[model samples]
Target: VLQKILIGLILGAIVGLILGHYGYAHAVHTYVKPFGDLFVRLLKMLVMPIVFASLVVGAASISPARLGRVGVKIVVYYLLTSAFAVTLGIIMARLFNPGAGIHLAVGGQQFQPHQAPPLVHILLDIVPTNPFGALANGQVLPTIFFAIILGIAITYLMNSENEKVRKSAETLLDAINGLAEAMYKIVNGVMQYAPIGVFALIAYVMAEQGVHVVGELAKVTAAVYVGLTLQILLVYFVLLKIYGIDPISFIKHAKDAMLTAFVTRSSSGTLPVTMRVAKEMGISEGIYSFTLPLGATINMDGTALYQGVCTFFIANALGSHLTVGQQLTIVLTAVLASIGTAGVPGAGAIMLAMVLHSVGLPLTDPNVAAAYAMILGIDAILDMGRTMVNVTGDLTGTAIVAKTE
Candidate 1:
């Protein structure tokens, strides 16, 4: 399955490059866009249940105290890694000067900074007023919060005398587990079309943006790729080594899922494979079942890093000088934004928007929006790396939990 996806991605990219270079716009529009959209939608349709079910099951099975400790560790590690990733992005963007000397067409539209929800509000908001709303909106943090509460509640209830109710709830949870397994089977069926979808997505992007777009943003593209590679080697690989993880074997084992993410560019869609890999690595079912889903929903280190780099690039492109405080604000915003806006598609762009909106930068500024547009064409190319990093984050958290256990 992994090999197939990689071949599809490589072949699709080659086709896209050819079509882009030669101006096959009509064919790209006709053939590629629909498949890409369909593929993404199909993947997205299953994400909510997978996350909710797995989390509930995982959390309920664990002791409450251990769950609390693991939860704290996961959040702390995620935030720390995100901050580090954003800093790397900012540093690399500055060094490469990817946005230097580029005069983008200006628009008159202005944007006001968004005041992020207060930490108190953020905390309160985690307890969903309506669990259905959280699921419907794909609001992952709230959903996870609610699911954990329900799971823990159910766990407590199991100690009661009402055997009938307890058995009923357990049966329902078991049914949910069965349904989640069914969804995994469905995903496997859907993934057989991955090649077609990849071809369309790549071709459409190429056709929509013309060949010269790459030339125009070559430096930025190169810089992002360089930074992403360095992140994989220096940050992720080093962590794996320190943890006594076989980095090579891990990557080798994850090749298929990584390829799927590269082509699909959807972490949620890649959850099944990631879960499987975690199990193969001997992570306990309790940990893999819970952490993988939560990680898929909230782990945005790759996206956050991309946002930081692009924000700096856009600011540079627009010739807006940022003070040290402003730069730090970008770092803070990217990290928080990554956490707050869980399960949002095109999250990299949204994170950038959050950063820009933080610093009173004009959102509609061509230099700003165009910088995002420039990266979108190569976003999937970078998503491959990002997904790998994301999986690493998940496994790292699992390992930490395992150690404590």
Candidate 2:
């Protein structure tokens, strides 16, 4: 499966290169767009329900006190890692000055910053007033919150003599798990279209921007990629080593989940594979049953790193220097946004936008979009690296938690 996916990725790049070099824009726009859109939409369709069901099942299986301890550790680890990622991004972006000599055409439209909810409001909002609203709006953190509560409630009520209700809920939970599995099957089936999707996505990218843009932003791109690679090699490997895990063996074990993430570009879509990888790695099912699902929803380390780099790059592109305070704010905002924006679509981009705006950068600037567009073209390529880091992070966390257990 991993080899097949990698082959698809290579073939997709070849097709994209052929189409873009030959300027077959219209054919790509017309014939290939649907496959890409359908692939993403199909994955998106399953994300919410899978997250909800998986979290519920995983949490319900845990004792409340252990769940509390695990939850605290997860949140703390996520925030700390996110802050470190952002700080690294800011350092690299500043040192490399990735925005030098880049001139982008600006439209006459004025920039308006998007409003970010306050931390207090963000925390309060996690407890959903309406579960359906949370799902409908794709409010991931809130939905996960609700699911955890529901799971806890069911667990608390487990001893009731009403076997019928318990049996029914158990059946429903089983069905939800089944649905998640079915979604995984669908994703695997649709993956054959990956070459087409990647081709179309890349062709459209090159058609809109041309190759000159890449030449201009090469340094910044290189730095971002380098920083990401360093994180995987140093930070992730160190954590694994401390846990007595063989990093190479771990990566080999996680190849399926990593490939799934690369092809789908959706963590939630790759959850099933991640669960399997955890089991294969000898992580206790109890630990995996909770951590993998939670990690899929909130583990945006790669995305968070991208957000930090892109935010700094955009600011630099606009000749706006971030103050020390603002740089700290970038770290904080990136960490908060990663947690707050869990399971949101285009989450990495959206979080970047939020961070840029928070620091008084121009959100509506054409250069901003262009910068993102440049990164978007290579998102899948970069996402391959990001997903590997993410899965490694998940397994690392699991290993750490297992030690405690």
Candidate 3:
């Protein structure tokens, strides 16, 4: 399966490059982009139902304390690793100095900065007033929040002395659990079409961006690639070591999932494959279903690190320097801001813009927006790397949790 996806990707890139170099770009975008677009929408259609069912079922089955403990461990691992990645990114920026000498304050119509939502509002908003609305909107964090709380409520109801209520809880559990199983089956069927999706999707993206985009943004591009690579080698290796797991074997098991993530540039799109890797690693559904879905929504080690690098590069390019306090704000903001980001492609740019917004960057300025566009123009190539990191972190968190269990 992984082999087929790679074959599709390689063929797509080769064809895309050929068309881009010649003059067939218009035909490819007009004719070929829809195939990949449909596949993505199908994958997204599965996310809410799958996450809600699995999280509800998983939370309801376990003791509240047990669930909380496991959740804490997972959350801690996510936060610590994200902080470490951001810290490493900051260090890399200082060393590489990729932002030096580039004065870019022009407004770009393509990439506008987004202001961060207030933390109090962020907290208040997690409890969805209407869960169906949340799911329909594809608001992941709020949806997960609603599902977990409702599942716990159901569990408490199951403990009721009223036999009727207890029976109701049981019946509801069976139905929801069945929904999850049904969704998983659907996911498997959809993935069978994945190779074709990649063939057209990646080909269209490459042809549209053209190879010259890389050369124009090579310095920033190099930093992202280098930062992600170090995170994989230095950070992930030590993380797995702490659990007595072999990185080689773990990565080998994760190869299909990672490849899918890289090509798709979506952690959520890759969730089905990552969960399979979890199953292959002997992780229980209770853990994998809960951790992997939540992780996909929030565990953004790659994005956090990439944002750190971007903060510095953008500041330096604008001939501005980040004070110690400002840089610290970036780190903290990134770790927190990552939670609101979705699991889809290009979500990182929004998150990055939020970070810049936190530091009072002129997101509204045409120059600032253009600077962002410059980076975003080549984002597809960079997104693949970060998505792989996101997928790896998801699997790693699951593996560590399974070990403890």
Candidate 4:
């Protein structure tokens, strides 16, 4: 599936260049863009429900004591890796200045990022008056807040002694999990048309602004991949060495899993492959089953790094600035976003959008759409890389858990 998506991406680029260069841009906009529009809307429809269901099911599935014990280790693992990735990404972006001085001809769409709201208001706003309205409004953080409440409530009910209540919780959790699976199926169907979306999105952006936008995006992509490479080499490898896991053997054992993630561009989609690798490594089924599956949903090193680079890149592209305070915001938000972010179509873009929103970026600006469109064009190509990084994180967590136990 990853290979198919990659082929679509390259073909889209080739077609986009041809259309933009041969005066067929109008035809693409008129005739081909609707397919992309359909794909985006279809994915958007899945976002809120899918997020709600997945969170509820995940939270309800685990006991409080187990969640506290194993969850802490997983949480700490992801947080540490994410902090490293986000900080490294910011440093590299700032060092390279991936979004400076391009000055494309996209008109007066750019503007100052929104003023940072007061800290008190931000905190107060998390608990929504109406969760449904928050979901409808595309308010990710607030929706996450509401979902967390329900999930906790469900978990509490499941831990009760009454069989009726516990059984009810189980039934409801099962339903929600089914709903999430259904939404994932919808995403798979929608993604079939994504190649056309990528093609049309690129054609429109390139034709409107010429090639300078592409050049800047290429720089951001490079910095993100570089950050991912550094995380694996410097952090994961060193951890493996200290823990007495043969780094080469670990990599060799996990090769199939990594390749599956790379090609599928999905953490969850590659779970079976990862499990097979875990068996090959001789890790206990207890740790790998819990950690790998949990890590698939939450451990997102590649995504954290990508979002960090993207947040900085968008700030620069639209000529906004991030202070030390806001850079710190990226570190915190990226980790939270990774855990909450689903392996669904358009989810990563939505995740980036949510991150930008948290950092006070002007999400509503006209230029923001232009920048997003350009990034969306190359999203799949980068997604593959990030997903591979996610696979490595899962394998590393599996090893560490085994070593300790």
Determine which window of 10 residues in candidate 4 has minimal summed lDDT.
107-116
Cα lDDT of model 1 by residue, 1-405, tens digit: 666666766777677778877878678778678887787777777777776776667655566666776767777777877788777878878887666667554543445446746789877887888899888997766887787787777777677799898898788778767866776676677777766776677666555553645553677666666776777787777877787777788678666566656555667766765665666667765676667667776667777777677777767666777556668887888887766545334455655677776765667756666655656666545555565565556666666565555
| Per-candidate count of clashing residue pairs (backbone under 3 Å) | 2, 0, 7, 1
TM-score of each: 0.85, 0.80, 0.89, 0.60
Model 2 regions lying over 4 Å from their true place: 108-110, 132-138, 160-213, 279-286, 318-326, 341-347, 357-360, 364-395
Top of the candidates by TM-score: 3
How accurate locally, in lDDT, is each candidate?
0.68, 0.65, 0.79, 0.68
Ranking by TM-score: 3, 1, 2, 4
Angstrom error of the Cα, residue 370, model 1: value is 6.5
Kindly list the per-residue Cα lDDT of model 3 for residues 1-405, writing each as its tens digit: 767788998999899878988878888889888888787777777877887887788775476656777789999999988888887888777776656555454546654443446779977987898999997887777888888887888889888999999999999988998988888888778888888888888888778764645543677778777988999989898889888999999888888778778877888877766776777677776688778877998789898888888877767766667666668888888887666667787789777777887765666666556666777777887787888898898898888887886
Task: Kindly give the stretch of ten consecutive residues in candidate 2 with the minimal lDDT sum.
Answer: 204-213
Quick one: how many clashes does candidate 1 have? 2
Give the local distance difference test score of model 1.
0.68
RMSD of each: 3.2, 4.0, 2.8, 7.8
Q: What is the lDDT of residue 230 in candidate 1?
A: 73
When 1 and 2 are scored with lDDT, the better candidate is: 1
- Candidate number that wins on TM-score, 2 or 3: 3
Per-residue lDDT of model 4, residues 265-333, tens digit only: 657655555665676678644355456655776778788888888887777777777765668888888
